[PDB]
Amino acid sequence: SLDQIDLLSTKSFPPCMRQLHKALRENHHLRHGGRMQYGLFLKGIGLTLEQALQFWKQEFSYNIRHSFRTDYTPFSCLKIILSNPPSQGDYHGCPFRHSDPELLKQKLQSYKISPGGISQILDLVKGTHYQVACQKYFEMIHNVDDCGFSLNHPNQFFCESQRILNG
Amino acid sequence: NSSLDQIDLLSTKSFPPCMRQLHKALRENHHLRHGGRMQYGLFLKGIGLTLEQALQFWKQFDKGYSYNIRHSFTDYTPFSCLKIILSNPPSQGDYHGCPFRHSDPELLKQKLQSYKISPGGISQILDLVKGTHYQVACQKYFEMIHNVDDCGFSLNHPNQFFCESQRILNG
Amino acid sequence: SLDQIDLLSTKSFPPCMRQLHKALRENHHLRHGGRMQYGLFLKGIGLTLEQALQFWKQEFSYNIRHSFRTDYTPFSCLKIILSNPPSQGDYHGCPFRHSDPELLKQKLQSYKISPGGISQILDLVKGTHYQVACQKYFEMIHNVDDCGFSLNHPNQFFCESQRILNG
Amino acid sequence: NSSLDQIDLLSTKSFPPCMRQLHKALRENHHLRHGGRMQYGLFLKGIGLTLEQALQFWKQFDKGYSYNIRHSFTDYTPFSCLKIILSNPPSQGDYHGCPFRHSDPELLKQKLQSYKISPGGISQILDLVKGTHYQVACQKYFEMIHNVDDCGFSLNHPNQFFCESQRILNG
Numbered sequence: 001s002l003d004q005i006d007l008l009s010t011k012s013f014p015p016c017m018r019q020l021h022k023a024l025r026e027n028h029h030l031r032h033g034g035r036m037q038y039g040l041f042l043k044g045i046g047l048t049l050e051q052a053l054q055f056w057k058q059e060f061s062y063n064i065r066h067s068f069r070t071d072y073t074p075f076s077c078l079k080i081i082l083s084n085p086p087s088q089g090d091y092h093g094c095p096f097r098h099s100d101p102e103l104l105k106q107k108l109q110s111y112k113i114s115p116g117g118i119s120q121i122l123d124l125v126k127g128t129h130y131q132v133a134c135q136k137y138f139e140m141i142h143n144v145d146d147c148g149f150s151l152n153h154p155n156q157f158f159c160e161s162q163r164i165l166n167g
Numbered sequence: 168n169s170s171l172d173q174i175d176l177l178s179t180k181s182f183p184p185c186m187r188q189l190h191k192a193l194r195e196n197h198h199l200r201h202g203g204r205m206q207y208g209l210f211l212k213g214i215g216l217t218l219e220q221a222l223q224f225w226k227q228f229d230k231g232y233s234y235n236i237r238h239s240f241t242d243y244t245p246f247s248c249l250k251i252i253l254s255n256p257p258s259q260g261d262y263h264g265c266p267f268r269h270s271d272p273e274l275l276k277q278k279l280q281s282y283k284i285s286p287g288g289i290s291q292i293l294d295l296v297k298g299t300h301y302q303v304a305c306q307k308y309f310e311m312i313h314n315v316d317d318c319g320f321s322l323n324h325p326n327q328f329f330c331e332s333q334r335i336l337n338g
Numbered sequence: 339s340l341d342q343i344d345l346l347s348t349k350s351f352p353p354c355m356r357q358l359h360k361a362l363r364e365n366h367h368l369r370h371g372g373r374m375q376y377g378l379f380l381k382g383i384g385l386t387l388e389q390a391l392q393f394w395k396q397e398f399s400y401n402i403r404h405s406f407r408t409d410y411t412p413f414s415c416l417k418i419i420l421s422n423p424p425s426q427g428d429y430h431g432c433p434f435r436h437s438d439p440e441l442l443k444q445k446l447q448s449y450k451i452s453p454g455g456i457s458q459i460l461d462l463v464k465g466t467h468y469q470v471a472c473q474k475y476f477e478m479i480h481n482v483d484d485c486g487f488s489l490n491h492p493n494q495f496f497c498e499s500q501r502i503l504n505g
Numbered sequence: 506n507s508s509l510d511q512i513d514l515l516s517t518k519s520f521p522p523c524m525r526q527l528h529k530a531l532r533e534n535h536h537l538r539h540g541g542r543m544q545y546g547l548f549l550k551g552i553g554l555t556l557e558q559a560l561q562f563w564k565q566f567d568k569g570y571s572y573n574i575r576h577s578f579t580d581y582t583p584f585s586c587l588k589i590i591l592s593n594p595p596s597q598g599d600y601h602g603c604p605f606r607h608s609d610p611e612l613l614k615q616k617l618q619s620y621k622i623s624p625g626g627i628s629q630i631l632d633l634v635k636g637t638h639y640q641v642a643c644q645k646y647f648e649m650i651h652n653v654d655d656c657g658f659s660l661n662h663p664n665q666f667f668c669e670s671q672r673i674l675n676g
């Protein structure tokens with residue numbers, strides 16, 4: 001079930017995907033924009049997001065499984081940041097770009113980022129350096145001084161996080 | 168959960184024509200209407216496998232479904248031959264039913280040819296179908312497929328066909 | 339893990355395989371004859387029996403999983419009955435053929451077969467009708483008057499049992 | 506648990522030569538000696554996959570092992586390039602190590618040819634190897650495989666190679 005990756009989402013998902021996992025868990029649904037952003041990200045980690053149905057019910061809960069018709073290429077940071085701004089009721093997008101800075105601050109606080117770390121991230125967001133802000137977030141949650149890569153894809157954030165957590 | 172392609176070979180070797188066609192249609196179309204989900208899903212249930220229908224995240228002509236199977240270890244009962252033959256005839260969107268009963272003989276002939284049944288076997292099957300001896304035609308199919316002279320049982324259930332097929336294949 | 343099929347073994351395994359599952363569970367090992375008889379039977383139901391190792395341990399617990407080099411053709415009743423009589427320390431074979439009738443009676447009692455049912459089975463065993471005794475056992479545990487098949491393979495016993503249990 | 510063949514394609518696309526060869530040897534031989542289980546198993550660990558070694562029931566030249574992978578969600582650390590290059594040189598039974606460092610140049614040439622690297626690419630790789638520039642040779646391999654002029658990073662870890670490869674493939 002979807003809840004098997006709650007811990008993983010907090011430890012290794014970038015903020016854009018962490019928020020989608022939380023929303024799906026809390027709302028029991030995501031609109032298409034969110035299903036696409038999060039579903040493709042999961043596909044990039046080797047997981048298929050799907051809704052379980054009952055075959056014996058006539059037409060006329062979300063699950064994850066190892067993957068066993070469509071373009072499964074996961075969205076990059078620039079695709080997320082520059083296109084499809086979320087409307088109310090959407091949970092997709094990049095929080096560094098799309099969240100009100102006051103809300104972003106509160107979100108980072110809930111993520112247990114230090115006040116000093118939050119100040120650095122917000123400074124970067126104000127300069128429109130969204131991916132660099134995200135690198136700073138990465139550095140904070142993994143307790144490393146320098147992430148040592150140039151971030152431009154959510155699946156790269158995940159991949160680099162896994163290297164540290166499984167270090 | 169596992170992919171449906173995991174039983175492609177099993178279907179050809181041991182599924183009777185009614186279930187063989189449903190597996191094929193599910194694989195090619197990525198979906199079956201309710202009559203087929205019931206007939207095929209409950210047949211799998213009888214073997215001890217649960218079919219699961221799921222909706223893929225990307226769906227907003229591809230209905231966006233993915234099916235999987237797993238070992239089972241609501242109260243619906245797997246269909247007998249008589250239930251399949253005598254009730255729920257398939258409409259145009261449907262792939263269920265019994266091919267010996269429900270397929271036009273010209274199309275049935277073509278299907279048996281695609282299964283590589285001998286001309287002599289096909290002739291015997293079609294003559295049995297002409298007499299409305301559907302289950303006996305299916306026994307002939309069983310015999311042709313397993314290369315035995317006598318299936319050794321009286322066919323009354325797709326799940327019986329499966330068990331008897333596996334018993335031969337298992338020696 | 340192996341324990342996931344404890345219930346299945348009691349409900350659908352013929353006595354020859356039920357005893358091997360129990361022995362493997364209790365002894366944490368089976369000699370080769372038992373590993374072969376039981377392992378091939380499981381393969382016939384679409385399961386792979388294997389022992390989990392630790393890759394990081396230098397060389398110089400049993401698991402079951404869906405199957406993903408050797409002949410995997412499962413043993414028939416006659417192969418089991420007529421060959422490889424079990425020595426002490428072996429748990430393979432066919433209990434109708436290989437168990438002392440006093441022990442077979444006790445085993446059937448533990449399986450909750452009625453006294454009348456046990457008498458019928460033992461009569462058949464004395465006549466050397468091992469497979470027919472097994473059919474009678476099948477009829478008793480599934481509460482049917484006539485099994486409606488001619489038994490000659492343990493995997494056929496399982497297949498026919500599944501039809502009833504999932505009926 | 507899932508079959509190792511599930512990452513055959515992934516290995517060719519995104520595994521550096523050191524891990525690519527270990528995956529191939531594991532698939533063909535159905536086993537690796539300890540140095541290879543460590544190097545490849547820990548590389549997979551770094552990706553977030555746990556390799557499992559198991560002994561098949563039938564084992565009493567086929568050692569009787571079966572390997573599987575699953576998502577990981579003892580304290581051994583995945584090997585860096587320097588660890589692979591400078592320590593634990595492979596003996597004759599071993600498939601571990603760094604091919605740029607450990608393969609005889611004639612055999613390395615043959616291996617790169619089997620990978621369908623251009624003659625020009627192979628020449629450049631071999632010249633780098635001649636200078637003992639193993640990681641820079643591996644960067645050249647990365648560039649040839651992904652059709653980019655500059656890998657854009659300084660290679661120091663097989664798991665870094667993997668992440669950078671996937672980032673390109675993911676756009």
Ligand code: SF4
Nearest residue numbers: 014016077094134154
């Ligand atoms: S910078 Fe990229 S990875 Fe980070 S939250 Fe934004 S879109 Fe996601």
Ligand code: SF4
Nearest residue numbers: 183185248265305325
């Ligand atoms: S005779 Fe019975 S088992 Fe054979 S195809 Fe028809 S319904 Fe299926």
Ligand code: SF4
Nearest residue numbers: 352354415432472492
């Ligand atoms: S008769 Fe056959 S299926 Fe029954 S216990 Fe003996 S060997 Fe097993």
Ligand code: SF4
Nearest residue numbers: 521523586603643663
């Ligand atoms: S240079 Fe590093 S990543 Fe490349 S093959 Fe050698 S050890 Fe592996």
